[PDB]
């Protein structure tokens, strides 16, 4: 890999996220590092109308601008959302919605909180010479006290950074199927599909950390966005930058690179149709940092591992190969499992059958790839 | 240039030389698309798709042949769910060709619909294979019905396509000289990139010769048009064999086009940027492409950029010439809003707004990338 942005050690996770800013930009700061007490103080509307409007060029690197998205990004969700409670504000105020606008700009992103922001750049080790564990780590931003935000953010960052294991794998996939080393590309998936396999391990302990009814209730309030959103129909508007309001998706997983990145390695055609499933997929990319959708790009513009793999006539290349496939199975499967926890049980307490149905179609356009 | 993106030196992004006779164990599909006129004609091409056996896409063997199976198959479809042209629609496409159909497609990566990419650029053949490709030594391999015009608007895009295969050539060349800091060769692409974005307007000239306004725009269109927010398919179509549901596709489109988002995006003119319909559009037609060009598309979308490039310089002359580019592609789509004044606009009038908005807001997006046009 060369200049998509990718690590070998926590792959599309930002490495070392800077935790502070310049001090030109402390207003920023005080409010998302306070967003707990301003938003249950009633305070954070106000101060955030009283902010003056800052300029992103003190911001030159790229850390730099990162932590700025997130930081702005937090503090127009808070605004947006307010306590959480349904009232909601249409107008985010120009003296932040045109930094946020212009920076986002900058960075080819969308102004609008996103997965490359509140998890990818949104994290810290508590002792920098102990290992990437959750008791070692934690978030630098939250919404609300006990929105679980940290459960949920670092556990899947922690997941994200198991399959980084996997990715560094991928360029040495792609040479043994051009000089024809048939033993080289069996280790490759096999240790491809260890990776996911491990990964799904990972994955148990989002029920330590992240609890139903904080989730459904407070967490993912303040994570939605404004596409299609009914309390939003127009989308919001960027006051001061855009003439009208402009509708935005919220973050989403699907806005995580490394799942999308393993269906294109392994030609799983989770964008092909005009179904609903490949239309979101194919839009999320949109909302993954550009170095991430060139990535992306490139894995596509490689010749097809499923089609060299089905051409050899050879049952240890289909077995490791069918081995990733039940892999990104296992980890769907296991998926939809926390969604009926986390979404679906919660929702029934207080439709999104829909919900289910996209997962169970990308679920079952993974199935149908196995090979025998 | 690097082949593995299925690009032609001389026909750029058009399949060269497409194949006109499948095997002959596919003689009934083939029978029914040359003879789609005649059979439209006389109400029997629906009774000869329903009277088809199932075939095997298996001997279709070469990219060449399932390129022209996909063409005859999507000739076929569209006069099936249209049949005659005024309103008798059917809504389920029989198993028989709708299981071939969606098999080729999936091994593809196209939609199960006509599209672009079959019957301009995989729909043509040398009358004599010793001459130019001009117009008159040039046919298409299908139609629609008699007096559809179809020759004259496939092969006038196709000519236009073909005009700007001389600019996508030069590409590389534009990457490698930002690369190797090589002022003068740089210069000298984006002037010859400019040249052939010229010649293709005047190619477009030809419409006006061989494409009537009336022909186009209550036939060939049509037969072109697709099944996606369309009411007479509300919910699309059922690929009867192959999917329990209808499925929503859309129909052939110059926005499938790879020329001209190519160059939009080779010169930092943000065409798919952004969340208004416009891009939408734009980004949804990249699926409608063959996928070895929008990998090219996207790839194009990761190298650096040239606007900004030469905006770092300081040097008139590249400028200059980029502002040639850029002004090429404004006299292209400023053409354009003219012929689709002249085939579509003034035969609906003996709604269409829509229309006329994308191209000017895809017109004035290229307008504004200008470095110089006070
Ligand atoms: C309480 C925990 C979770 C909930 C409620 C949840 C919910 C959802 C939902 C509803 C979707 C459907 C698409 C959408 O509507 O956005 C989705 C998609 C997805 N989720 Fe989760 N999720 C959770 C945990 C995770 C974690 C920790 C990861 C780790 C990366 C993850 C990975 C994915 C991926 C990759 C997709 C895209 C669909 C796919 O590629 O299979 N999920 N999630
Ligand atoms: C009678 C002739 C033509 C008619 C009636 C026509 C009509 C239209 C219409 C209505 C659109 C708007 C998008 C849509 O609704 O599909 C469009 C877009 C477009 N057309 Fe045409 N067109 C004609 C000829 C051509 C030709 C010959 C070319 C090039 C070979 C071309 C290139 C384009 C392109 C590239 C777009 C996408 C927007 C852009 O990039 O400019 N058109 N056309
Ligand atoms: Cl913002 C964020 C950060 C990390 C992971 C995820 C996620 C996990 N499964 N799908 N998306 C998200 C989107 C969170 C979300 C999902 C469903 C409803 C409301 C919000
Ligand atoms: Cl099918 C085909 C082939 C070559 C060029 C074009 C075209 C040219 N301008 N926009 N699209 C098309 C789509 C033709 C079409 C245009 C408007 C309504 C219905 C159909």
């Known amino acids: 890999s060369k200049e998509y942005h990718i690590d070998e050690e926590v792959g599309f996770a930002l490495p070392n996220p800077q935790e502070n800013l310049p001090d030109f930009y402390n207003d920023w700061m005080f409010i998302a590092k306070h967003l707990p007490d301003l938003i249950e103080s009633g305070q954070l509307r106000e101060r955030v109308e009283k902010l003056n409007m800052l300029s992103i060029d003190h911001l030159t690197d790229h850390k730099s601008q990162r932590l700025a998205r997130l930081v702005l990004g937090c503090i127009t969700m808070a605004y947006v959302w307010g306590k959480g409670h349904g009232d909601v504000r249409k107008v985010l105020p120009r003296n932040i919605a045109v930094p946020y606008c212009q920076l986002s700009k900058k960075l080819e992103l969308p102004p609008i909180l996103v997965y490359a922001d509140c998890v990818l750049a949104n994290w810290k080790k508590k002792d920098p010479n102990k ?11 939250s919404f609300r006290d006990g ?9 899947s960052l922690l997941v994200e950074i198991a399959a980084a294991s996997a990715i560094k794998v991928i360029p040495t996939v792609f040479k043994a199927m051009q000089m024809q080393e048939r033993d080289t590309l069996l280790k ?4 491809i599909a260890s990776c996911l396999e491990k990964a799904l391990q990972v994955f148990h ?6 609890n139903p009814k904080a989730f459904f209730s407070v967490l993912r309030i303040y994570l939605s966005g404004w596409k299609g959103n009914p309390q939003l129909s127009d989308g919001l508007v960027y006051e001061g930058f855009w003439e009208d309001p402009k ?8 806005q995580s ?4 990145c393993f269906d294109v390695l392994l030609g799983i ?11 979101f997929l194919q839009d999320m990319r949109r909302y993954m940092p550009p170095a991430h959708r060139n990535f992306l790009c490139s894995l596509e513009s490689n010749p097809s591992v499923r089609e060299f793999v089905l051409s050899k006539g050879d049952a240890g290349l289909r077995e490791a190969y069918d081995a990733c496939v039940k892999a990104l199975v296992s980890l769907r499967s296991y998926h939809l499992q926390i969604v009926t926890k986390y979404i679906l049980i919660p929702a029934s307490q207080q439709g999104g059958t829909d919900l289910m149905n996209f997962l169970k179609t990308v679920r079952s356009t993974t199935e149908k ?3 025998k």
């Not at 929105?147 to 556990?155: E, H, T, W, Y």
């Open 131 to 141: 290992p990437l564990t959750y008791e070692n780590m934690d978030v630098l931003f």
């Open 147 to 155: 929105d679980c935000s940290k459960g949920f953010f670092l556990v």
């Open 188 to 191: 490759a998936l096999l240790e």
């Open 205 to 210: 302990q989002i029920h330590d950390h992240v």
């Open 247 to 254: 509708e935005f998706a919220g973050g989403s997983a699907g």
């Open 257 to 260: 690179s490394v799942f999308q």
């Open 269 to 279: 055609q989770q964008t092909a149709g005009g179904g609903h499933a490949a239309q």
């Open 369 to 371: 790839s196995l090979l």
